[PDB]
Amino acid sequence: ELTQSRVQKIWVPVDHRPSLSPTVIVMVGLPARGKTYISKKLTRYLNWIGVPTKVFNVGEYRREAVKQYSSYNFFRPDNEEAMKVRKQCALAALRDVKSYLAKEGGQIAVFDATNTTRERRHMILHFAKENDFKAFFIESVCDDPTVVASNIMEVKISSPDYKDCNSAEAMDDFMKRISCYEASYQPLDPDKCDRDLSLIKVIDVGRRFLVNRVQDHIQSRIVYYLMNIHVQPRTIYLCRHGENEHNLQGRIGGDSGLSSRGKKFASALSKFVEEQNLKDLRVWTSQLKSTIQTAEALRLPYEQWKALNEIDAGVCEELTYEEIRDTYPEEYALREQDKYYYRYPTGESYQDLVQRLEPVIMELERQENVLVICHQAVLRCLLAYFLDKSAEEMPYLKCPLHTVLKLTPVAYGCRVESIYLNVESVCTHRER
Amino acid sequence: ELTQSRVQKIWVPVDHRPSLSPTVIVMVGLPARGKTYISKKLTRYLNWIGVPTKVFNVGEYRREAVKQYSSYNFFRPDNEEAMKVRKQCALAALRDVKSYLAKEGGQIAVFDATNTTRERRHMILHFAKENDFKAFFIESVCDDPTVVASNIMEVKISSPDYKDCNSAEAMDDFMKRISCYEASYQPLDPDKCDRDLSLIKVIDVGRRFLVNRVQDHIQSRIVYYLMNIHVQPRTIYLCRHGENEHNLQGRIGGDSGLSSRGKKFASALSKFVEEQNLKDLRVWTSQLKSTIQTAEALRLPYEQWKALNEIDAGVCEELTYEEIRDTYPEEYALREQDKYYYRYPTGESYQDLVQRLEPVIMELERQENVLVICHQAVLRCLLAYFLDKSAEEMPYLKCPLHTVLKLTPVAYGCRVESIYLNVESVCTHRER
Ligand SMILES: O=C(O)c1ccc(NS(=O)(=O)c2cccc(-c3cc(F)ccc3O)c2)cc1O
Ligand SMILES: O=C(O)c1ccc(NS(=O)(=O)c2cccc(-c3cc(F)ccc3O)c2)cc1O
Ligand SMILES: Nc1ncnc2c1ncn2[C@@H]1O[C@H](COP(=O)(O)OP(=O)(O)O)[C@@H](O)[C@H]1O
Ligand SMILES: Nc1ncnc2c1ncn2[C@@H]1O[C@H](COP(=O)(O)OP(=O)(O)O)[C@@H](O)[C@H]1O
Ligand SMILES: O=P(O)(O)OC[C@H]1O[C@](O)(CO)[C@@H](O)[C@@H]1O
Ligand SMILES: O=P(O)(O)OC[C@H]1O[C@](O)(CO)[C@@H](O)[C@@H]1O
């Protein structure tokens, strides 16, 4: 009466007759307030945890409908012609939102635009109602000219809009562009007029928050996430344990210690960390010996996280892939056809891993400088979150032994630099 | 050079020469605002996740220092004598806070009192600084007379203060008592004056929040928790899967299906659920067959949570306790001496379980009516959270087969009612 699904190992009822609530996230705020930053980052998180999510950026539509950008005159409230085009762009983007949530299997749509007037948000609110969408608002408020100017410098002057421009011209144009929105801007007011909307106001670059009427599970998760990200500059280092005894034999999982090359890698990592010369580096390890041994070489304090333990291979723990193929050929084959979803028997899938890692991801967002010493599958999962890689790609990312990945959060994403530390090891990578 | 600790199985450096930042949570708000409710509940959560936490209730000190309560005249601002006693009570409680955090190994102290003036909070702030304590503020704001009156009815009229009183007298006294605080009350203002304090304002019974300057990991976890609890009436039902084939043989873990008695229990549970006649019951199961089979009998929609899977016995999975004793006598003995902390090899401890369950607990707080069909160890862990049971007691709670535990959140805690559904089963309970 119940059968176990062969790939994911879930118990489902046998079916002998197999022959016969989405959300719009609305961005709100003046330009250079980090709205797109938040859009892209939240969407990265949501897709990584498995909630299919898509950004609809009104400006990207405008750049599609109007070939070259001239200047802020385009944004003047008295520009009858431009205003028509901009309104049509928003409506076109909202039509794609509808198509995405109602028809293409998407669960969250992030509507990335200014949305600074009650008029406009009323229209968006009526749109979600008509279509049976929940609406959630994220307003970014920034009253600090230093931050605004830094923002413009960081992401505005080098965007496509300002391709034939120097700094002072682009900066100057952009301040005036901001000006066009200032006059009619009506902040979200949950005290009085917006009493009923589900929203979060992000204040002082994420140090203060107003949150109103969280409706549901996903909204609550979004709020948690948003409240713990920050934009302090930092560096994230990810690597595997130094080579271990099981690596040498091509055995998966288990709890083996460093091979002598692994020990050499640990020393090398110590030297490397020492010369990065970092303020307040947090070091994290799994609870498996190989990662702990590697962290010991650093003579720094480290924390062990059960949640960083390598993927669990269930009955296949401590086997070679060959022993897996000979002993469990049907399991071996299943995994090859669906590597992200496949669960080892009594063990885990990459999908399970992602879920075990949520607390790690959330704490990494809270930290600054961190070094995570972990494992192949685990490292693939973390890297996929940072680099916005898909579930289908995640189990084939290349994370080789003895190599540090240096991640530098930049605006809208992540710079990855690879640094091999010159100690030989086996290769555990396996192509599709 | 590294050795594996025998109980918890953690790798630590061998030590050949073994011969040689706490927080005050400050409650803020008028009486009957739910401050003690929040104190007791947050402290329940924090202790359950392993952060040692203690409530210091100024009123409990006052009732200790002044035998019988007379009336609200005691709380008059012009009562020179009472005010001296009350001030001395706060200071005595703050002295115990200091003793607890600095000397008795406690990590969070919840200072449960009104703390409604800037004067008073300045004094508390200076106290934490002097002692190297972080200070975090929770203010409960309630502007809805209906809620206030309901609160007084619910917890005030039947407290020790009002032992020789009828409702209308106690209610009447209490409104006047509230009055004494109203005049000098200065809410937290993070806009202007409290710009620098770490705080959360809870507004509209937990539907709106102001959050300012979260400093650290634990503060961020407290905020998450506070923002997802609610006081809507609800019922929580917890039970195990119907008896399974492994139960009959005294085997632990594995993924066996219902014995025929288990099937009878499932039907019985269906009948039971049907006659509780509940609005919108959510049903949760583990991903193990026995719980899924039981939920099938209900003909209701259910959700499977990997996180509800029974504790993992590692190498001992699918063994009898006797086979454990004969095959792993040193492991068997270790577990008996330290059942909460002991980790099975390649497996889990109850401590691991608690951590896997955090997302379940958080989602249970968000829900209303829920039925959780799970497993012995898992059920002990959830029950310990709800009933404020210690880590040392948690692995010996009695959660027998075929028996529903009906939990009714009441103010300050949880009513547990047991309901046996009259189907025989083995007993899997094991005394210390
Ligand atoms: O082209 C862009 O870069 C762009 C960026 C944001 C943006 N914001 S919007 O909310 O979608 C929008 C669309 C059309 C008009 C307006 C608008 C703009 C104002 F300045 C004042 C009132 C308004 O209603 C705003 C519109 C745009 O065209
Ligand atoms: O006895 C009680 O039930 C009680 C309950 C709360 C409480 N709040 S308290 O912040 O600790 C406190 C202690 C001493 C004086 C005051 C106080 C009370 C006021 F009405 C006005 C100004 C103040 O400074 C408040 C004091 C109490 O005595
Ligand atoms: N809460 C915030 N307040 C102010 N600036 C922020 C915030 N979060 C991110 N930023 C900054 O915003 C910049 C990105 O700007 P962008 O997202 O293009 O703004 P907008 O979409 O509002 O025009 C980055 O420099 C980033 O550091
Ligand atoms: N955010 C809140 N606002 C108002 N009332 C609440 C809130 N949370 C809990 N309550 C209610 O508060 C009551 C408990 O009162 P209590 O904690 O004794 O108040 P106080 O300690 O402020 O005198 C319960 O009835 C509970 O439902
Ligand atoms: O998903 P894949 O490609 O099998 O790689 C994960 C494997 O890598 C290892 O970390 C090291 O070989 C194993 O412990 C684990 O089973
Ligand atoms: O901690 P204890 O008392 O061994 O009980 C937990 C055991 O109970 C069971 O749920 C049922 O016997 C086992 O699967 C599990 O090992």
Author numbering:
A (entry chain A), B (entry chain A): 3 to 22, 33 to 444
Which text from the study accompanies this structure?
The homodimeric 6-phosphofructo-2-kinase/fructose-2,6-bisphosphatases (PFKFBs) are key regulatory enzymes in the glycolysis. These bifunctional enzymes synthesize and degrade fructose-2,6-bisphosphate (F-2,6-P2), which acts as an allosteric activator for the rate-limiting enzyme and committed step in glycolysis, i.e., 6-phophofructo-1-kinase (PFK-1). In contrast to the PFKFB isoforms 1, 2, and 4, which are constitutively expressed in testes/kidney/heart and liver/muscle, PFKFB3 is an inducible isoform9 with increased expression in response to hypoxia, extracellular acidosis, and inflammation. PFKFB3 also stands out with a kinase to bisphosphatase ratio of 740:1, while the other isoforms display a more balanced ratio closer to unity.
